[PDB]
């Protein structure tokens, strides 16, 4: 087997993404036969250099996940990636912690395979063009550059939320993500500040290939805006050495393999 081409010849480009449609994972499982237990997939006709672990922070977002699985599996396969899908389900009902959930995904995914790249994706964002490759680059990669929710514009130049990707080394270089952001907002700006503090830049696909759709939804109880968020992002320099992968503590309550994804239910503590 030879290494897959730099660009995949299976790519179609712009695709039609809609969410009025109903989804059945059985059909999805059925439409995507190459996808093995736990949502793992490896190219059978070429060797791919990207061993990607796609991490999804999660809690009470099953319908969104269904659409995510429905659209992304066919896409990822076309991108000729050797990947796996990890849904990090937060147990309990205390304040949501997006970033800590992502750190957990990093540690748990490594237990399965030697992934070298990590894509962190909100459950409700779907790429509109398969040229927007879900892998890592020489620089941390911001993937959802043109979200319809923001009218295809970056809400602000340093925006690093939605979907992003960090190689195993880039992730390790910043001590992973912070564990101290409970509730909505800021965790992603902290991460962006971490990158800059370790001397890195952000790589992005152009605004046309980077178009992506966000599933319109309402607020989730227990993920209200975090008031101390402004104060935390202004002090990232002082807290990133101690808050992150090296201070990460959680408890896996269960690991369930579903055909389209591995679901890891975890107790990540409470704020204080």
Ligand X SMILES: CC(=O)N[C@@H]1[C@@H](O)[C@H](O[C@@H]2O[C@H](CO)[C@@H](O)[C@H](O)[C@H]2NC(C)=O)[C@@H](CO)O[C@H]1O
Ligand Y SMILES: NCCCCCCOP(=O)(O)OP(=O)(O)OC[C@H]1O[C@@H](n2ccc(=O)[nH]c2=O)[C@H](O)[C@@H]1O
- For residues 176 and 251, what is the distance between their CA atoms, to the nearest angstrom? 18
**Relative orientation angle of helices 98-110 and 187-197, to the nearest 10 degrees:** 60
**Contact between 246 and ligand Y per CB under 6 A:** no
Can residue 98 be called a binding residue for ligand X (CB under 6 A)?
A: no
Is residue 189 at the binding interface for ligand Y, with CB under 6 A as the rule? Answer: no
The least CB distance from residue 82 to ligand Y, in Å, is 24
Nearest one of 99, 101, 97, 67 to 212, comparing CA atoms:
67
Is residue 219 a contact point for ligand Y (CB under 6 A)? Answer: yes
> How far is CA 155 from its chain centroid?
19
Quote the distance between the C-alpha of residue 27 and its chain's center.
24
Indicate the residue among 124 and 130 with the shorter CB distance to Mn ion: 124
* Residue 155 makes contact with ligand X by CB under 6 A: yes
| Binding track over 218-237 against ligand X, x by CB under 6 A | -----------xx--x----
Q: Does 188 bind Mn ion (CB under 5 A)?
A: no
Q: How far is the CB of 254 from Mn ion (least distance, A)?
A: 25
Stretch that binds ligand Y, among 21-29, 50-58, 75-83, 109-117 (CB under 6 A): 50-58
Q: Tell whether 246 is in a known binding site.
A: no
Annotated ligand binding at 123? The verdict is yes
Residue 43 region by backbone torsions, left for phi larger than 0, else alpha for psi between -120 and 50, else beta: beta
The Cβ of residue 57 has, within 10 Å, a number of other Cβ atoms equal to: 24
Beta strands in 112-226 (DSSP E): 117-121, 125-127, 141-142, 146-147, 163-167, 211-214
Q: Is 223 a binder of ligand Y (CB under 6 A)?
A: yes
Q: In this complex, which beta carbon is closest to ligand X, that of residue 40 or of residue 142?
A: 142
Element (H, E) at 71: helix 62-78
Which residues of this chain interact with ligand Y, rule CB under 6 A?
Answer: 56-61, 96, 98, 122-124, 184, 218-220, 223
Q: Which residues are annotated as a binding site for UDP-alpha-D-galactose?
A: 57-61, 96-98, 123-124, 184, 217-219
């Amino acid at each position: 087997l030879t290494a897959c081409p730099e660009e995949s010849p299976l790519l179609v480009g712009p695709m039609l993404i809609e969410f009025n449609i109903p989804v059945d994972l059985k059909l999805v499982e059925q439409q995507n036969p190459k996808v093995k237990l736990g949502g793992r997939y490896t190219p059978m006709d070429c060797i791919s250099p990207h061993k990607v672990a796609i991490i999804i922070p999660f809690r009470n977002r099953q319908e969104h996940l269904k659409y995510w699985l429905y659209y992304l599996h066919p896409i990822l396969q076309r991108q000729q990636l050797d990947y796996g899908i990890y849904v990090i389900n937060q147990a309990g009902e205390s304040m949501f912690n997006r970033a800590k959930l992502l750190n957990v995904g990093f540690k748990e995914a490594l237990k399965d395979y030697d992934y070298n790249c990590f894509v962190f994706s909100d459950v409700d964002l779907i790429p509109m063009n398969d040229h927007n490759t879900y892998r890592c680059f020489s620089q941390p990669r911001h993937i959802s550059v043109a979200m319809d929710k923001f009218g295809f514009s970056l809400p602000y130049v340093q925006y690093f939320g939605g979907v992003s990707a960090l190689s195993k080394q880039q992730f390790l270089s910043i001590n992973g993500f912070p564990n101290n952001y409970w509730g909505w907002g800021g965790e992603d700006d902290d991460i962006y500040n971490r990158l800059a503090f370790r001397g890195m830049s952000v790589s992005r696909p152009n605004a046309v290939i980077g178009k992506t759709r966000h599933i319109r939804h309402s607020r989730d109880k227990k993920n209200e805006p975090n008031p101390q968020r402004f104060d935390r992002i202004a002090h990232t320099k002082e807290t990133m050495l101690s808050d992150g992968l090296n201070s990460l503590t959680y408890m896996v309550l269960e690991v369930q393999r579903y055909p389209l994804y591995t679901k890891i239910t975890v107790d990540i503590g409470t704020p204080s």
